Symmetry: D2
Subunit: 116 residues, 4 copies
């Protein structure tokens, strides 16, 4: 529940299903340490990545594997993957939803940060 | 349930709350006939606009009153309102969600069309 | 050039060429009067719609005929057209660039406004 | 000019000026080698990063330093930077324009690719 990813397909107007998502956390030596991963569900969502206890303050990267999604559809894409890099902050609202809207040569990403 | 609107604020990373939304349907003389309206909830969503029986095939317009949302925040905006104009089709998936992502000088809108 | 429209295609990563654009201006009786129209060039841009002298203060609507663009590429898109509605020149003359980035089931519209 | 970066500010409706941009290229050992860097001009554009000769096939990463841009405007944004990762020149030389549209809690990134 503190980190959710939602991915939509702007070409088909649908959730983007079965997209691989890898989360990393930035280590003290500046490398990216694997943190969590999964595939989006039938509703384009990936829940259950981490817990409140482990999602401590720090810098995280969410990679969304957009190229493999488009290739499966036979559509030749621009980006290798979409990247979302941010600092997790204890002060603000407690839930972070990372949304991504995908097109072959463009994507947007937005963070919705809310309280239950 | 066949038509839902969801609105997000890209400046604050939050749902856009208390945004007025007016839906129109295009009449046989080409004018826009009021159809439904409401304000987005605390989660940025507006449900309950119409029913399956009345949401027949035709051209609809969804106006989102973005200027009043930004003015309330003290932020001077570009657009008078965001407009979403589309044909409702019985053939495709049965639920239409119109999403809008708002910034003072830009917005995106996406249609997610799915089956329950 | 006080008003310029630029349209890009997010499926192909290219300018959206030969897209029809209609501009209207709200009259004192509340109707939308035809103001100017044209088609985007090879660069996806439409210049020459108006002059400083004719582009007076007002509420303008830029209608970008996105459905016909997609149909001619074999795509059946969600929206009929993208509309951009804004007050212009209400604090003196400005230059406006209205951009639209198109995908079949999504678009974004942006304005860059500069003071000559 | 085979690689050009353009950055716009969706809060102000303006070019995003003096944004730092770092370009990297993936080496055969998988590390990201520094390739070129610069800052956007008054127009929000960064030209002159590379030459046809140096811009060979490869996987490139364009890192746009959006956090520092917002902080200097008094805004505490969500993302550390926007990353754009793509394979270039894998079917011969192309021209690439990488655009980013920024808001505090959202960005979109787009590419227009043309064949000289
Ligand atoms: O939405 C993006 O990712 C940036 O796209 N917007 C673009 C863009 C994108 C590209 Cl690749 C080239 C030019 C523009 C442009 C020019 C004027 C204006 Cl007002 C907007 C834009």
């Amino acid at each position: 529940c503190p980190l959710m990813v939602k991915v939509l397909d702007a070409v088909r107007g649908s959730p983007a299903i079965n997209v691989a998502v890898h989360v990393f956390r930035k280590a003290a030596d500046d490398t990216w340490e694997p943190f969590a991963s999964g595939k989006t569900s039938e509703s384009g969502e990936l829940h259950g990545l981490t817990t409140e206890e482990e999602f401590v303050e720090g810098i995280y990267k969410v990679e969304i594997d957009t190229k493999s999604y488009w290739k499966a559809l036979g559509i030749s894409p621009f980006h290798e993957h979409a990247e979302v890099v941010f600092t997790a902050n204890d002060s603000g609202p407690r839930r972070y939803t990372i949304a991504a809207l995908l097109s072959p040569y463009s994507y947007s990403t937005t963070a919705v940060v809310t309280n239950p």
